[PDB]
């Protein structure tokens, strides 16, 4: 159950996710998963990043959920659960701004 996950923030807005992630104390890869503001049944993986060009900034990746069961950011790489997706992207940056590291503080 995703509701049970500490990185699942459920129904918060994109702006709020940004407010929480743009904390100077957050290293690259700080993240949270939330409901998409405008797509029923899809989620957003909000991730903090940092470089000298943009400083501290946030990237939002849409996570798709198949009726056929799979979770994915890119259809080429699917998972049986949102937990497995989160675990995979904590080890591989692949197309993300940074691999997932720590859950975002409130
Ligand atoms: C409005 C905005 O910010 N758009 C996001 C997509 C997006 C994300 C969340 C979202 O939330 C709803 C909300 O704000 O509530 C909505 P909305 O519902 O607002 O329309 C739209 C975006 O464009 N992010 C970028 C992220 C950085 C990379 C470039 N890109 C394309 C891409 C390329 C490669 C990969 C990839 C990832 C991992 C491995 C392999 C490939 C992923 C994305 C994005 O999507």
Curated annotation (Swiss-Prot):
Q: Looking at the record's lineage, which domain of life comes first?
A: Eukaryota
Which residues are annotated with the PTM Phosphotyrosine? 43
Q: In which tissues is it expressed?
A: Expressed ubiquitously. Expressed in the skin (at protein level). Platelets, neurons and osteoclasts express 5-fold to 200-fold higher levels than most other tissues.
Query: Domain named SH2: which ranges?
Result: 7-104
Q: Where in the cell is it found?
A: Cell membrane; Mitochondrion inner membrane; Nucleus; Cytoplasm, Cytoskeleton
Disorder cited: SRC kinase activity has been shown to be increased in several tumor tissues and tumor cell lines such as colon carcinoma cells. Thrombocytopenia 6: A form of thrombocytopenia, a hematologic disorder defined by a decrease in the number of platelets in circulating blood, resulting in the potential for increased bleeding and decreased ability for clotting. THC6 is an autosomal dominant form. Affected individuals may also have bone abnormalities and an increased risk for myelofibrosis.
Q: How does it assemble?
A: Part of a complex comprised of PTPRA, BCAR1, BCAR3 (via SH2 domain) and SRC; the formation of the complex is dependent on integrin mediated-tyrosine phosphorylation of PTPRA. Interacts with DDEF1/ASAP1; via the SH3 domain. Interacts with CCPG1. Identified in a complex containing FGFR4, NCAM1, CDH2, PLCG1, FRS2, SRC, SHC1, GAP43 and CTTN. Interacts with ERBB2, STAT1 and PNN. Interacts with DDR1, DDR2 and DAB2. Interacts with CDCP1, TGFB1I1 and TOM1L2. Interacts with the cytoplasmic domain of MUC1, phosphorylates it and increases binding of MUC1 with beta-catenin. (Microbial infection) Interacts with HEV ORF3 protein; via the SH3 domain.
What is the documented function of this protein? Answer: Non-receptor protein tyrosine kinase which is activated following engagement of many different classes of cellular receptors including immune response receptors, integrins and other adhesion receptors, receptor protein tyrosine kinases, G protein-coupled receptors as well as cytokine receptors. Participates in signaling pathways that control a diverse spectrum of biological activities including gene transcription, immune response, cell adhesion, cell cycle progression, apoptosis, migration, and transformation.
Q: What else is known?
A: May be involved in blister formation in Pemphigus vulgaris, phosphorylated-SRC is abundant at blister sites but not in normally adherent tissue, which corresponds with loss and disruption of CDH1 in cells adjacent to blisters. Phosphorylated SRC is increasingly abundant at pre-lesional sites of blister formation and occurs prior to changes in abundance of CDH1 and DSG3.
Q: Per the record, what about its domains?
A: The SH2 and SH3 domains are important for the intramolecular and intermolecular interactions that regulate catalytic activity, localization, and substrate recruitment.
Query: Protein name, please?
Result: Proto-oncogene tyrosine-protein kinase Src
Q: Which section of the whole protein is represented?
A: 145 to 250 of 536
